[PDB]
Structures are given as structure tokens and as C-alpha cells.
Amino acid sequence: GTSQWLRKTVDSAAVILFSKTTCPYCKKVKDVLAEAKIKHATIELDQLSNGSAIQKCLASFSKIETVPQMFVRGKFIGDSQTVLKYYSNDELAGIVNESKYDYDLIVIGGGSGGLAAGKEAAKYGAKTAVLDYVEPTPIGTTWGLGGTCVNVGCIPKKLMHQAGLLSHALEDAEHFGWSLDRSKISHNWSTMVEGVQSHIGSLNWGYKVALRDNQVTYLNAKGRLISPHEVQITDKNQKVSTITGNKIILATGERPKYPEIPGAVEYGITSDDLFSLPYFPGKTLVIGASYVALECAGFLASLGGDVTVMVRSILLRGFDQQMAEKVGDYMENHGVKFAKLCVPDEIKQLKVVDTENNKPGLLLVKGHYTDGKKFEEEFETVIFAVGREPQLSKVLCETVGVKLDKNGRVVCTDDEQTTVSNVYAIGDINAGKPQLTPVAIQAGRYLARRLFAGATELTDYSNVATTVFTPLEYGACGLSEEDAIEKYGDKDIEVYHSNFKPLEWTVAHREDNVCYMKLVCRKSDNMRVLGLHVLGPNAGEITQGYAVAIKMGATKADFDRTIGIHPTCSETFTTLHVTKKSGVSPIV
Amino acid sequence: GTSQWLRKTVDSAAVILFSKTTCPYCKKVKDVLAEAKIKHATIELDQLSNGSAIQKCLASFSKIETVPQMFVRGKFIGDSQTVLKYYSNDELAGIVNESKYDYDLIVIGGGSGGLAAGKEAAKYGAKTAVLDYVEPTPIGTTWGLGGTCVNVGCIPKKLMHQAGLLSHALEDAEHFGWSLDRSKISHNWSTMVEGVQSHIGSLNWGYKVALRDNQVTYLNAKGRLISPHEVQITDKNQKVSTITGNKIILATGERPKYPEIPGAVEYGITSDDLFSLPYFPGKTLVIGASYVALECAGFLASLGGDVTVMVRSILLRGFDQQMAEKVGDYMENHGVKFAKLCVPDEIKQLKVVDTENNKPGLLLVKGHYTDGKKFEEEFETVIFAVGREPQLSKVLCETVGVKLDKNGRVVCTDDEQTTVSNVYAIGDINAGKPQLTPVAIQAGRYLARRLFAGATELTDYSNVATTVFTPLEYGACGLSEEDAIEKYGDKDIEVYHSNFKPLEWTVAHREDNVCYMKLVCRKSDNMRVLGLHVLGPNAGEITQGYAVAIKMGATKADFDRTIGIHPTCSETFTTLHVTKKSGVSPIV
Ligand SMILES: Cc1cc2nc3c(=O)[nH]c(=O)nc-3n(C[C@H](O)[C@H](O)[C@H](O)COP(=O)(O)OP(=O)(O)OC[C@H]3O[C@@H](n4cnc5c(N)ncnc54)[C@H](O)[C@@H]3O)c2cc1C
Numbered sequence A, B: 001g002t003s004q005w006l007r008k009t010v011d012s013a014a015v016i017l018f019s020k021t022t023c024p025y026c027k028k029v030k031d032v033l034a035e036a037k038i039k040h041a042t043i044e045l046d047q048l049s050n051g052s053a054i055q056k057c058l059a060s061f062s063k064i065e066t067v068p069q070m071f072v073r074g075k076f077i078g079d080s081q082t083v084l085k086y087y088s089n090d091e092l093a094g095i096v097n098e099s100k101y102d103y104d105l106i107v108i109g110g111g112s113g114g115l116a117a118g119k120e121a122a123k124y125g126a127k128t129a130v131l132d133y134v135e136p137t138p139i140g141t142t143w144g145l146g147g148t149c150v151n152v153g154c155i156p157k158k159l160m161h162q163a164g165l166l167s168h169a170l171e172d173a174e175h176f177g178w179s180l181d182r183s184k185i186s187h188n189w190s191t192m193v194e195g196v197q198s199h200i201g202s203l204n205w206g207y208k209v210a211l212r213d214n215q216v217t218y219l220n221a222k223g224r225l226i227s228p229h230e231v232q233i234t235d236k237n238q239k240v241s242t243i244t245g246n247k248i249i250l251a252t253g254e255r256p257k258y259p260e261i262p263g264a265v266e267y268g269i270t271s272d273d274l275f276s277l278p279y280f281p282g283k284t285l286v287i288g289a290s291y292v293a294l295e296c297a298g299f300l301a302s303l304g305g306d307v308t309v310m311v312r313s314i315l316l317r318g319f320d321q322q323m324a325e326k327v328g329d330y331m332e333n334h335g336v337k338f339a340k341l342c343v344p345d346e347i348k349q350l351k352v353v354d355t356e357n358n359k360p361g362l363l364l365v366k367g368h369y370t371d372g373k374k375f376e377e378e379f380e381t382v383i384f385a386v387g388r389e390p391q392l393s394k395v396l397c398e399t400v401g402v403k404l405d406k407n408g409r410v411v412c413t414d415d416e417q418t419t420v421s422n423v424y425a426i427g428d429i430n431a432g433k434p435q436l437t438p439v440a441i442q443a444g445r446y447l448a449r450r451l452f453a454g455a456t457e458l459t460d461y462s463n464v465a466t467t468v469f470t471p472l473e474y475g476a477c478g479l480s481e482e483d484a485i486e487k488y489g490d491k492d493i494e495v496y497h498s499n500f501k502p503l504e505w506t507v508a509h510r511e512d513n514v515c516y517m518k519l520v521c522r523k524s525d526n527m528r529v530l531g532l533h534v535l536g537p538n539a540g541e542i543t544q545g546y547a548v549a550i551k552m553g554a555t556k557a558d559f560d561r562t563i564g565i566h567p568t569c570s571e572t573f574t575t576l577h578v579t580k581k582s583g584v585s586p587i588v
């Protein structure tokens, strides 16, 4: 075990120092490297249980069993006197810069995963380049550094969600004694967009500054992997060049899909366009039933939009379907219209977007319900949210030897390795992984640490918590009820559940018995919590802490023993008692 | 172990059935009892690991080793044929009603603990009485069933806190694109109070209905324990009577303290009066620095009040003092004035409350700072929040033999037993216990289950999470940093920390580097999380889930492995890295 680990660590690390905490010579080297501004990984052997065995194994690489020992790109470069010799002769900078390739790491993609990986690698002295390019949407929308989440995803989505929530805070205010004339209050889409875009702008800038401060080379360039170590780059002027890298991280993410219908690409928009849209969507049709579809429909309705969601089959496929129905029901009860069992056939333009008064155009949507009745209705904006897709034909040459699955995603090992051994893939393009920002970030940081700092820790992709930021939010961690039943059998599953009502909703005169939570548990495994689900306000804040407990293997008894904080929504998880099998009502 | 448990269970249970899940005769008895509307505890022996040993030990009580076996108040009453005999002869109701005392349980106090205990006991066939009386405040304020939390505590406090938070939602709305004229918006205290009081009214009613539905006798009467089994009751007409009970639960809670200064009782108010106050407090002085003091000062300021807090020494004594300072700093930065190192000497009336126009009076507060400078300032309302005290001289005769500590609180065993063996104490009057609503409720339910259903489970009073609902909320679970250092030594404590900024605050233009979180960890115990602390919005929702993980013995590694939900405030706990010892800035 130790021999394998040390071999991999020496082979892969860009600059690494083997040391001990109580070592005066190790400190001398550390001080020299710090003065010379040489970043590096450090392994303190006296902080590892196999540290003595590691010390002895180092002689297979250096011929010595003492500390300190410094390595650069797979080669022992010296002990304490040797490093200080390089230093006094002005040879040290040259030695630590010596490389077969232009970079130790090239990251293709400057999004959630790629930026996380690139910054983390640079910390340990890996010579790093991050490439980012944003291919314009069909209408021409583009954006700056940071990826999907920062520019056209989690960040602007949640900010618009908040603008939506404030709509209802305005109503609630009156019941709590605030005197205001709601009939004279309106929302300005464009003002909201400007505020959101200003914040996104500060993030674009912040990431650029961060890369500079970490000595990462940032290239606003389209990258193409043409061989295992060669990346072809195309800049803004269309000038083509080649750079070389030892390790390659593919982190190019996905883009929205369009349905294959006449008028879709020409007249429809996606989430890519929505978050910087210069005009008010107005009367909107959202085609799709993904978490993106419902989130966007939701905030658009709360901002006073006339909103219809066209649903082919079900909502939130892959999510707990009881919870998905509850999410949909709340939206429907609050004005979101659902065109159920309906598919679109054709989109026709009736009016072009007014680019001077910033007003939407007008569209005619033609379709049909499964019952054969025709759908024909005018909408000012049509948004497609029918899923997202990798675009690796734009990123990798087929002769490189990176294997993709049927969906065009990269087939990876549990340490993100592709079929090309120096090439790794993280984030949304990694086949089978939850497609979320903190997952991409964790994967990128953990990978960079394994590659360049001798870490062993893999990213745990199991029981990753999620939150859907619909008008009433839905948080989950672990298995849906249906998945747990399929896996373990109905007889081995117990479900504890309850409705609840936020205290805030009482004076506000909001719904009884709408907010809902459940714990899906395994009877034969000490009532192990397999899945946690909550529909309610601040569901992400509620859910997060429980994800740690679930990771640790929480049982129903652990929940029972723990005391609630009052008054909160979350405390309801501490006193659950009604089982589904008992048939008792979950109402309170 | 088994013999001791069975002896206690038989001795204490009011009505109990020993049974097995696959037992046709046990079902016959169950059906008979259900038809006769006889509530009872049930112990299923085939669901206990020592069930076979229990079956054999039952013969020491009944002379038989078979199931079913039914017991009433310490006596075996029969097997299956015997119970059905009583049933067919119309003797069963008489047998299960036969008792030495009027009640199996008398609960003195109809608050958080008492109602929880009384309702839970009734479920297992304990003949139960709940006594509640609300002694008026010096100005005459009184309220209905439910206790401190329901009427003059957590419920109205959090509702007023929400009215306060809505103040700032109104400001935020503008930055998110909402068009409104804030210069024309004002708050009406009385309208808010009416809304809050209507909700409290529904809770008063709900609890009364709940007791009726559970067949609990509710007496709106002042109770006095005059001997171990005798409770003297005084009704509204001042008629005095005596009732007897087997088990007694003392759950009488606490009332606000007044400082011993001229004018305090005559002209000041407390939290007891504040939540139904018919007039606007106006320019207010809050005397005290408890969580109650700061919470009330906080919402009063957000509702446009001119608010001063008079602080003798420190804020939130007993809470983490770094966090307490941060809580105070936020309040001070947002308009709450603090009269530091200042004590009050005298309160003089300048104007009487206008009882027709519902306007406050006016007061003159005279005091002095520790530097000798005089304090002399006019306030419309003076609120004391200088702590709370038990009042058991109003509840128990000294000859009963219940031991109290120096503070007047009841000295209890770890199963809530007093020095009088049939007498128990729960909630705020139980010496040394965290004084919180869910603690009282857990204690009451768990006690009732041990007394009447053979449960063994004790209430766990360790690592009980809390939340202070100040303008910026403070959630905690476990040890303060100072307490952990005192207990384990500075060398054994590592503190991970970070500032954060809610995404919601970006567009709203609120503070950077004000929200804050830390994990206080023990180095020698695998970096065990000893204390969790968060200053930020929805801090109770953030904190709760982590309390389960902490209960289970979470380490820093468990936090690290767990993936964040984005975008949330809580996710910041999943990626903490800056230690206090490193001296690196926690800023982001
Ligand atoms: C509307 C929406 C809302 C979402 N909300 C949430 C949420 O609330 N919480 C959450 O956790 N997740 C959310 N997500 C998902 C989250 O955005 C993604 O999981 C995350 O951004 C994936 O990061 P990544 O590194 O894999 O790819 P990305 O962030 O997409 O970054 C890839 C980058 O590489 C660039 N690129 C592509 N090809 C090349 C090339 N050839 N050369 C150079 N650069 C290239 C891309 O243009 C892009 O900039 C949301 C997604 C969407 C669409």
C-alpha cells in the first residue's frame, strides 16, 4: 500500500517536499523556498501512521532515508545542503521550472470544476493554464469567466428566485402591520437584471483576479485536445496555436438542448439567454419539466408573469415523485398553468423583439395534447428547458482515445481518470455523477490534491444533497421513496412523515398542510435514514446539516434523540412519528 | 437488569398489556380494549432482545409465563379469558378505573413541559389532570393556556422578529426591481399585536381542545402541593379544594425578575406585558443583556423604534463571547444604542399611558455609568429583561420534602425525580437544564413514557442547539470556544472559521464579512466537533441539522466529506479551512 502510494505521489507531484514538523533542516528549506517564492506541496511524515515506512521507501527514489527530501516532476533534486546550493548559485528557479511540457496542468473549461481544480493545483507549484471560451447562443448571448453556475445558472437563478420571494414578503408585510399600497407596486424586470448582472460582473472579475493572484495562466481561448499532451487553442482573433501539458483536466460542461421543431432555434430562448434578457419575457411558455423549467416558471410567475409550463409526461423525472407532485401542486395553486400531456410542434414568429423599447416580440405555438386536441396559443416568450448536453466533439479529437458513453459524456474511473491516463474529466461531463456546482468543485479540488500534493482522498458522490428553488423549495438528501422500495423491498422500508406550517405563515394567512417532510428508512438496518425530503421555505438551509448526519449513517433513533430548535421549520425532523404504513394522517 | 426494569414498569404503569406481535389471543384483548375505549400501554416482547427473559420474570407478578398479560396500577388483572370475562360481565370499566387516588398523574403547570407530559401520559391510560393558572403581572396582564413560549415567549417573539425582518425585505425589494415608495410606508404596532394575539388565541384554544380529545382533565386553577399525593386547588371564584394523584409532575416554569429600584414594579414592563401591549412602546430603554433583552431591542428597532439597551457588564453571559460581541456589533451598526457599563437607579413617571388613544406614557430614568457620570434620560417605555426566576414558594409547601437549590430550582435526578419519589420536575424549574421549549417537551414526553409505558430512554440534555433571534440571528450547538479551551487546554483545541455573505445580500448591498461561522474542534479526539456557531440569516434552520451530526460525534473530516448545497449559507460549513492558530484572515 505504502510503496504504491509513494510511487504515484513522486511520479505526479510538480514540486514536493518530504519533511517532519520538528525538523530544523526542513524549516531551512521551507524558508528558502518561501523567500524564492517557490510554491510546493509538503508531506509531514510524523503526521502519518505509515510515515516511518515512507521514509525508508524514499531511498528507492533518492538513495537516502532522511528528511528533508525535495522532488521536482518525478526526480529527486536534493536534501537540505543541495537545495541551498541551488539557491546560492541562482540555479533553483531554473531547476523548479524545468519541464517537458509548457504546463504541469491544462484545464479546458473555466467553470465551477475547472477554476476549482486550476487554483488548487497552482497552490502546490503546478504550472497551470485555464482555458475558457463561451460559445454564443443562437441569438448571440455570451458572458464572462466562471462557467454555467456563475453566469447562467445557480447564481442568477437564485437571485431571481429571491426577487420572486420578495413579491410575497410584500404581501406578508401587511399582515404583520406594515402599511403600504400594493395596488401601486410593480416589478421592473430590467432593473432586476441590471442588479443581477452587476453581481455576475463582480464574479467574472473576481475569478480573473483569483487566477492572477494564484499565478495561473488564463487564456480566453477555445481549447481542443488533439493528442494526450497537446492542446490546440484558438483566440479572439482566430489565431491558432498549440500548448503542451503533462496532466489535462476536461471540465467543459454542458449547454441547453433544443427540441427538433421548426422555429425552435430561431425564436425560442433557453436559460442561457434568460438571465441577461434585455426585455421582459411577458406571457411565457416554458417547454420542459426539469428543475430548471420549474424554477424559471416559478420566479417568472412571482414577478407577475402569465406563465404556462408544457409537460410531456411527468415533473422532475429522477426526483421523488410524491415530492415532485407536491412541488407542482403548489405552483399550480399559485397561478402557474400547466399544459399537461402536451407536446410542441411548431413555433411561428408574430412580432420581433423591440430592441429600442426593450419589449418582447410575439410567438405562435402550435402543438397537440395526447388526446388529439390541438394546442394553438400566443406567447411573448418561449423558453426551452428540455435538458442539457455535453459538446465534446467541440473539445476533443476522436483519435485521442478518450472514451465517451452513449450520451456523449466521459467514462471515468472513481478518481476521474479517462481512458487516456494523464487526462481527467470533472463536473457535468463526468458520466453518472450528480450535476451540481459543489460536486464539480469538490471533484476538482480533490483531484488537484491527489495529482500534486499526494492526497489519497476520493470524492464521495453518494448521498449528495440537492435543493430545487421552486416558489416553495424542495430539499432532498439520499434516496427517493420509490428507489428505496425498489432496492430493498417494500417490507424493509418505513416512511415517517408530517405536514408542517412555518410560524411565519400563521399571521400571513398562508397554507396549512402544504409544507411536508419525510424520512425514508430501512427497517432491517436499525432504521437507517436512506432518504430525507422537505418541501418548505429555506429548504436548502434546512437540508444541508442533515447531509452530514446521513453521511455518518444516521438512524431514526439519532433524529429522535436530538432536540429541536424552536421555533423553526427544521425542528419537525426531530419529532417525526407518523408512519405511512399506519395510514394515520400526516396533517397537523 | 431485566428484573429491575420489569418491577419498575409494573409498579408504575396505569394500564399495560404484555403481548407479542404474532399472538391471536393478544389481538383479542387489544380489540376488546379498543371497543371498550380503554387506552393502555403495550409491550411487544418479541420486539425486545431480552423478551424471553421478561416473559419468565412476569410469573413473579402473575404466576404465568404466557402472553397476553394485563396489569392495572401494579396488579395483574388477567390473561385473555379473564379480561374477556370482565368485559362480558360489564366489570372491565370498573376494574381499569379502580385507583387509590383521584388521578394517576397531576401536572401542575400547563406550559411547554406540562402539556407535553399530560397528553403523553393520557395516551397510555393514565388518568390525568393538568392544572394551569397565570398570575397577573403587576400591571394586570394575563393570558390563556399554553405557558411562557406560547403566550409571552418563543411564539410572539419570533412573530415580532418576522415583522422586523419584513422591514428590511421592504428595503431589499427595491434593489431586486420592486417599485415602491418607502417614504410613505409605516408600521402599525397594534395591527401587528392583534395578528399575533389572534394566533396565540388559536393556540390557547387548540391546547384546550387537545386535552379534551385526550381525555385529560383541565383545571384553570392554582395548584399547591401540600403532601406527596395531595394537591390543593384554588379556582377563579377562590373556592379551595383538594385532589389526590399517584405521580406528580411539577412544571410551573419561571417569571421575569425586577431590579430592586424605586419605580421598577410601578412603571416598568417585562416580556410578559410586551407581547400584548395595547400601545406602541415608542422610545424604549431595555434594561438587561440577556437573549430576551437583545431580541426585543432588536425587533423594536426594526419596527422604527428609538431603542437603547442598558448593559451592566457583558452581552449574553454564558454564550460564546466572540459571537455575543458580533451579535451586539450588528445591532449597534443598525441603530440600537447601547448604554455601556451603566446601571439604573430610579424610574420616575412623567406621563401615564393613554388608555383611549393607545399611546405610551413617559418616564424618567436616573442612573450612573461606572465612571461616575450621571445618566438622566426620558423614555416612553422601560422594559426589564434582567433574568427569570422560579416561584415555587407559590407552588409547594416546605414540609412536602422537595429539595430546592440556592436559586429556588428543583434538584432532580437524571430521570427528573425530586427528593419526593413520586414527584418529578420538568422544564425551566429543573435545576441545571437548558431552559428551552423543546427540552421541556422532550423531558415531559420521555418521562410520561417511562412512568406509564415502560420506556427506559432518558432525556439527553447535552449539546442542545439554540438560536438567538436577534436582527442578525445567532445559532449554536455545543461548547463555546472559551469553555472548550478551559476544559481541554488551548493546545488541544483547533478553531476553523470563515466569514460569509448570503447571496441575497449581494444585490441588496448588505455587509461583507459580517456573517460568520466557526467549528471548535478537539485535536486529540480525531478533530471532534465540540461546538458549532453561526451568525447569519435563518440561523436556526442552518444549525438544526448539524445538531444530529454533533450528537452522533461528528469530526471535521465528516464535515469535509459532505458536499455543500449551492447556493446556501449553510454550505460554508462544508468547506472550512482557515484555522485561528494560523492567523490567516477569515474574510472572503
Ligand atoms: C439554470 C441552471 C441552474 C442551476 N442551478 C444550480 C444550483 O442551484 N445548484 C447547483 O449546485 N447547481 C446548479 N446548476 C448546475 C451547475 O451550473 C453545474 O453543475 C456546474 O456549473 C457545472 O460546472 P462544470 O465545471 O462542470 O461546467 P461549467 O460551469 O458549465 O463550465 C464549463 C466551461 O467551459 C467552457 N468550455 C466549453 N468548451 C470549451 C472549450 N472547448 N474550450 C474552452 N472552454 C470551453 C464552457 O463555455 C464553460 O464556460 C444549474 C444549472 C443550470 C443550467
Ligand SMILES: Cc1cc2nc3c(=O)[nH]c(=O)nc-3n(C[C@H](O)[C@H](O)[C@H](O)COP(=O)(O)OP(=O)(O)OC[C@H]3O[C@@H](n4cnc5c(N)ncnc54)[C@H](O)[C@@H]3O)c2cc1C
Binding pocket: A565, A566, A567, B108, B109, B110, B111, B112, B113, B114, B131, B132, B133, B134, B135, B146, B147, B148, B149, B150, B152, B153, B154, B155, B157, B221, B222, B223, B224, B251, B252, B253, B254, B271, B292, B394, B395, B426, B427, B428, B429, B435, B436, B437, B438, B440
Ligand atoms: C421572551 C422569551 C422568549 C423565549 N424564546 C424561546 C425560544 O425562541 N425558543 C425556546 O426554545 N425557548 C424560548 N423561551 C423559553 C421557553 O419559553 C421556556 O423554556 C418554556 O416555556 C418553559 O416551559 P415550562 O413547561 O418549563 O414552563 P412554562 O411554559 O413557563 O409554563 C408553566 C405554566 O405553569 C403555570 N403555573 C405556575 N405556577 C402554577 C401553579 N401554582 N398552579 C398552576 N399553574 C402554575 C405558569 O403560569 C405557566 O402557565 C423563551 C422565553 C422567554 C421568556
